Ligand binder design. Structure first.
Ligand SMILES: Nc1ccc2cc3ccc(N)cc3nc2c1
Lengths: 292, 254
């Protein structure tokens, strides 16, 4: 009778919308978890709608859908690519069991009750490449999505990328820089000069805050706070003052980098994406811009 | 050892009830039958709805562009809710045509001699910041595009009161070009009478770190006219060290 049972389980497992490659290797429990969560997903999708190696591969992050009690009803495949952890390993389980607690309250606040959500969370990563969950590491995800009614969170979890280990090319409109924990410039490359007008030599003593438009300081504050607590951030769009009048728009991804043999923090590395040209050229904002 | 059993049974209930043509029964069937029921039903039933999943969480849309011409090979209809743009417009078109003029060089370099990602302003002369994330494939780019996001004037000072920053509105507010305040201490534009009032005010903002304080005084306009002004300000402390970066004021004509 369990003959019939086990065999029907596996049969079931097979044509869930997944390869028998993975369908094959399931404990009945997983088949359940996944069955249900698959149904729930099709429902919620019906709730919102009233060949895809493209969308999967085009993405440099994955899709999570997570209930209000925190159970992750659905997760896109390529999560394994970014997190190591497979969809199979995860659907149905509590988000809180795979996230750095200390991030849990904040996760709870973005889980409930504008529906736009934008926050950073640390998640368990097990990737050279693959390890096991024993020595798992904390990976920061930028998560952006919408919450929905039930209550329900649909987010895209984008990894921030670690500057020493790139996978994408970089542009001419992108410069790179190093800071103390103070965000004092300690280093900057010589793309600055062409991009905003400073010699790198000039910025060494200087904290980064000297160069933000006042209108952006607090937002930056938020980023800093987060960079430190979590270890990485992507900042919003913000203006940096240029060598003479006016400013250019920017977006900076910051990563705390660690001494490998010391396991202490070292500096902050910043991939700084310049998003514009000097906007106001006529207008002078700070003391340095007045010289000459 | 056996609460395995009771959420296997929880599984069988919970599962059983979202299969409709099974939910529709007064009596609810056995193990295998609920299982094969779900099976055959699933068979009866992850593709473009994925696309809208993208549109809902990320506010994004798919597009393929030839690395050759920059001409748009394909654009997902999700472009329309994102960019307020007809698929029409993006099919006879080149992606260079769809961005900000200043964003062109960047684009030339993302389409040059793997995997790609960048930020650029795309038109809906009105542009929005868009993050495109994709990869190269047989010679093309398959990527996804994603969205997100006078009475007075603001200034910043070092603790001594030297102007270290003014917003351009200063010129309208007090008649001065930024150049004429920047570098000079704020108490110099102050009526001698109110100077102590200004000084002590700085004390209070620094002694008490983080909260805001207001002060009213006469400020020397560029036509040399004493202007009652309220300025209200607080210190800005580094998030890591909590020592004092500088003071932020807002100066509002009264
Ligand atoms: N490259 C960029 C990036 C963000 C921008 C945000 C803006 C907001 C308001 C406005 N009037 C113009 C803007 N221009 C931008 C140009």
């Amino acid at each position: 009778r369990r003959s019939k049972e086990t065999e029907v389980f596996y049969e079931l497992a097979h044509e869930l919308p997944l390869p028998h490659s993975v369908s094959s290797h399931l404990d009945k429990a997983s088949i359940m978890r996944l069955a249900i969560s698959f149904l729930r997903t099709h429902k919620l999708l019906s709730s919102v709608c009233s060949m895809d190696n493209l969308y999967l591969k085009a993405l440099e992050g994955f899709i999570a859908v997570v209930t209000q009690d925190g159970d992750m009803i659905f997760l896109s495949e390529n999560i394994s690519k970014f997190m190591g952890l497979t969809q199979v390993e995860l659907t149905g389980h509590s988000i809180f069991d795979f996230t750095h607690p200390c991030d849990h309250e904040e996760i709870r606040e973005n889980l409930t009750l504008s529906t736009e959500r934008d926050f950073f969370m640390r998640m368990k990563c097990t990737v050279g490449r693959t390890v096991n969950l024993k020595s798992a590491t904390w990976k920061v995800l930028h998560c952006t999505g919408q919450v929905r009614v039930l209550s329900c969170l649909i987010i895209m979890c984008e990894p921030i990328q670690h500057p020493s280990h790139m996978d994408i090319p970089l542009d001419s409109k992108t410069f790179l820089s190093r800071h103390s924990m103070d965000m004092k410039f300690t280093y900057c490359d010589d793309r600055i000069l062409e991009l905003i007008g400073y010699h790198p030599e000039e910025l060494l003593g200087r904290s980064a805050y000297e160069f933000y438009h006042a209108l952006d300081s607090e937002n930056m504050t938020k980023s800093h706070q987060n960079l430190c607590t979590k270890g990485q951030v992507v900042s919003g769009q913000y203006r940096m003052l240029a060598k003479h009048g006016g400013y250019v728009w920017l977006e900076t991804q910051g990563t705390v980098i660690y001494n490998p043999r010391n396991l202490q923090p070292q500096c902050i590395m910043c991939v700084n994406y310049v998003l514009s040209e000097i906007e106001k050229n006529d207008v002078v904002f700070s003391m340095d811009q007045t010289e000459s | 050892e056996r609460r395995r059993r009771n959420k296997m049974t929880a599984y069988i209930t919970e599962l059983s009830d979202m299969v409709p043509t099974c939910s529709a029964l007064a009596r609810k069937p056995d193990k295998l039958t609920i299982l094969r029921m779900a099976v055959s039903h699933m068979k009866s039933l992850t593709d473009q709805e994925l696309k809208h999943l993208i549109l809902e969480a990320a506010d994004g849309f798919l597009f393929i562009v030839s690395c050759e011409t920059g001409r748009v090979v394909y654009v997902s209809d999700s472009v329309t809710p994102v960019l307020n743009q007809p698929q029409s417009e993006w099919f006879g078109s080149t992606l260079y045509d769809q961005v900000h003029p200043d964003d062109v060089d960047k684009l030339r370099e993302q389409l040059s001699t793997s995997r790609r990602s960048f930020i650029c302003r795309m038109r809906c002369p009105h542009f929005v910041v868009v993050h495109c994330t994709g990869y190269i494939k047989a010679f093309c780019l398959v990527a996804i595009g994603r969205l997100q996001v006078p009475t007075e004037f603001i200034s910043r000072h070092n603790i001594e009161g030297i102007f270290t920053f003014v917003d351009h509105r200063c010129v309208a507010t007090v008649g001065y070009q930024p150049q004429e305040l920047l570098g000079k201490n704020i108490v110099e534009f102050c009526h001698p009478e109110d100077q102590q009032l200004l000084r002590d005010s700085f004390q209070q903002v620094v002694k008490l770190k983080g909260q805001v304080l207001s002060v009213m005084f006469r400020f020397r306009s560029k036509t040399r006219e004493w202007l009652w002004m309220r300025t209200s300000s607080f210190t800005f402390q580094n998030p890591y060290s909590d020592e004092i970066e500088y003071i932020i004021c807002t100066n509002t004509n009264v």
